[PDB]
Amino acid sequence: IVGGYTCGANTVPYQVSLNSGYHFCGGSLINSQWVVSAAHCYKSGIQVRLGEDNINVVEGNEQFISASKSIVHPSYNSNTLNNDIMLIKLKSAASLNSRVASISLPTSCASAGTQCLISGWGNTKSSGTSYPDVLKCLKAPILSDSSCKSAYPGQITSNMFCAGYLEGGKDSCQGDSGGPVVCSGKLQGIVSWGSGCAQKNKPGVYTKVCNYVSWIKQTIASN
């Protein structure tokens, strides 16, 4: 997250870290046994880390649970990042409490102008690299589809939305991928892609979760 603020420990209780020996992507806990993330975060050997703030220090509220099954969206296209969403089943159910909690799926899509909370452990610089140990937060609005398509001609599908600031300076970034965009208490987006981080006229692009709720529910019901 570039241009954000330190969330505070366990104030984003649905945020997870995906770990394969190191943090590599975020995700969101959507019930006690399932996480949603970005398909471009797929790999084998995932351990899901819940209840994290500092990802390098054991602080006392963590739950570390390995994945038993990953399901990348059937129509994921790694060249265009269309349908950049996957589901991860945990080997055992998490213990839910005030600091480890699920986030609700949306019943409707959020409109442009809605303010959302984006969070993650990704790079905090637009030029260069600096990776934080603690969770960073950013409040940002959903942008109109016209402004999103004007920023990224030929690249925005119906399964994507833009959020952020056209002036630059505030954005998600590398390492935030897969993490949540929460608006009015619902998961509306997944950190997916962008050109660089926090550049002028290049806002973040997010998977539009409201388009996937039927697939998510059906998949969980059968796996």
Ligand SMILES: [Ca+2]
């Ligand atoms: Ca920790």
